[PDB]
Amino acid sequence: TIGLIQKSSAPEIRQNPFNSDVLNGINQACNVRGYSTRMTVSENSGDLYHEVKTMIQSKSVDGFILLYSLKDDPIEHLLNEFKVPYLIVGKSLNYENIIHIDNDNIDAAYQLTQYLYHLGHRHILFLQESGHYAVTEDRSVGFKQYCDDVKISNDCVVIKSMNDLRDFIMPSVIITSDVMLNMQLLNVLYEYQLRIPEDIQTATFNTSFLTENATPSQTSVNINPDVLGFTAGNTIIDVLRREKLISTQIVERVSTTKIE
Amino acid sequence: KTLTIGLIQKSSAPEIRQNPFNSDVLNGINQACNVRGYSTRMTVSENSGDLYHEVKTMIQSKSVDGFILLYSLKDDPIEHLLNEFKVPYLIVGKSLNYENIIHIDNDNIDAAYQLTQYLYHLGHRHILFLQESGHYAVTEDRSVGFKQYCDDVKISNDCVVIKSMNDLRDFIHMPSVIITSDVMLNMQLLNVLYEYQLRIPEDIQTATFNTSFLTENATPSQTSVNINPDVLGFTAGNTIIDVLRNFREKLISTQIVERVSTTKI
After folding, report:
1. Where is the Transcriptional regulator LacI/GalR-like sensor domain (chain B) (predicted)?
2. Chain A CB within 8 Å of residue B24 CB
3. Which residues of B touch A207 (CB under 8 A)?
4. Are residues A117 and A47 in the same domain?
5. Are A83 and A172 found together in one domain?
6. For residue B40, which residues of chain A lie inside 8 Å, CB to CB?
């Protein structure tokens, strides 16, 4: 049995297409090798720590896959204190020599902004999801890195809530660090009658049914989560008796278009 | 004695697997199994042909103790297979093939009846029901409830099956409100309505089933039926463990969640 540690089981997190795809990848690998799986169910970090600890002491799992990366994560200290095997789907920031499978999110973001720049965009706004997770930080860094390279504004705003998003409401295109925040952005733009792409363009990360069928279809970065999961599943099985990066691609849709 | 429960999803294809209903029911099942000491295994097949042999391989490999079908389909080969091998299982949905098979579900017929009634009370008289393709029981039940209400108030009962996005667009006096049988079909409808510049709720109204982040944050927010999938999952998880340890049919309530997509006409 492999333990799958999600940062949270809360609706806004578990319902993210990313979780579904990564899990599908892992199940594909584990099924073929006679392994079952177990997912954490805690909604907050405090419970997650004691849930994962209860998991380690009850020996209900053989190894873990950490489905997120967080600087100074109590969970990683826990796993290391009890010498349990594990790997991360994201960047390794707390312990050296830990196996981690991830996309080069800084590059993914650098490339996305570059693509938009070449469409004619000069005023780009990056909406960052709340929290201090490595992936969000990596994407904001890539965005600001490109903006500094071509000397354009680098407005980066952290959205704490739907109301904070409304009050924040001009850039020619808005990039959101994740699809769930993107859905909220489209909602607010529709409320304020800002037509896409006529009045404003938008782009986000993680291609899925949600971006393809959004209102309107969203240009996004495909991070191939299926591959991340399959790789994570196989690699941890290998461990139980290194940095692997998965490529990304830009999927052009209705939300972006050449501007003059 | 694998202390594992096999989860049979109709398909692992994006459009299906990404449906928030799946994430919610799984979380519910997981809450039940983790506290009682059970593991989990979910199918990965993307079509019925592969799923059958995957399930049979699971049964023969003795890799699981019991199953939970996360769907219900008339004349499902999977159910014939499960009964032939006498393996314990329960259905999250309406039991249609073998009597005495335990099933946990919402009263989808009444949930649709109530949504249509709610819309009728707002002043709607020309309601269009969009049905997702497939012969799945849940979808048939919702179309049935809609038609029963239209029959009780003697109004139009236009019910159309959507095979794909293309058929949706082609499908396009227009109805005053459109109900979709599920959130994913609903996302596609909102996409088409936006393309055709039909504002919601000003130009037309919409409503769907399965309240979730996707309905609460749709464009615009969607009035929807809350079917409490986490409870369906928790209930299904505890019920299959009860059977494996040591028939029954359980229904989970539904409530209408009112949002921006609907308003008095």
Report:
1. 117-262
2. yes
3. none
4. no
5. no
6. 36-39
Interface check A19 vs B, CB under 8 A: yes
Contact of B75 with chain A, judged by CB distance below 8 Å, is answered with: no
**Method for structure elucidation:** X-ray
The first and second tokens of residue A139, run together, are 């994407």
Tell me, yes or no, if B4 comes closer than 8 A to chain A by beta carbon.
yes
Q: Give the three-state DSSP class for A79.
A: helix
Which pairing describes strands B223-226 and B255-257: parallel, antiparallel, or unpaired?
A: antiparallel
CB contacts < 8 Å between A and B, how many? 107
Q: Which residues of B touch A28 (CB under 8 A)?
A: 44
Resolution expressed in Å: 2.0
Q: What is the CATH number of the domain that holds B26?
A: 3.40.50.2300
* Chain A residue with minimum CA distance to B32: A41
Number of structural domains chain B divides into = 2
> Looking at the complex, does the CB of residue A53 fall below 8 Å from at least one CB of chain B?
no
Q: Is B191 left (phi over 0), alpha (psi -120 to 50) or beta?
A: alpha
Q: Are A218 and A231 in the same domain?
A: no
Which token pair is A175?
């990039």
* Cβ burial, residue B163 (10 Å; 0-12/13-18/19+): exposed
Whether residues A141 and A259 share a domain: the answer is yes
Q: Are A51 and A151 part of one and the same domain?
A: no
Q: Do A183 and B221 touch (CB under 8 A)?
A: no
* Full domain range(s) for residue B2: 1-106+227-254
- Residue A42's Cα: distance from chain center in Å? 19
Give the separation between CA A157 and CA A152, rounded to whole angstroms.
Answer: 16
Strand ranges (E), chain A: 2-5, 37-39, 63-66, 86-89, 100-103, 124-129, 156-159, 173-176, 201-205, 219-222, 243-246, 249-251
DSSP-derived 3-state class of residue A195: coil
Candidates B109, B101, B119, B237; CA nearest to B181 is B109
- Interatomic CA distance for residues A14 and A123, integer angstroms: 33
- Residue A203 to residue A124: CA distance in whole angstroms: 10
* Contact at CB, B24 and A11, closer than 8 angstroms: yes
Which among A24, A60, A213 is the nearest to B17, CB-wise?
Answer: A24
Indicate whether B170 and B234 sit together in one domain: no
Residue of A nearest to B217 (CA): A184
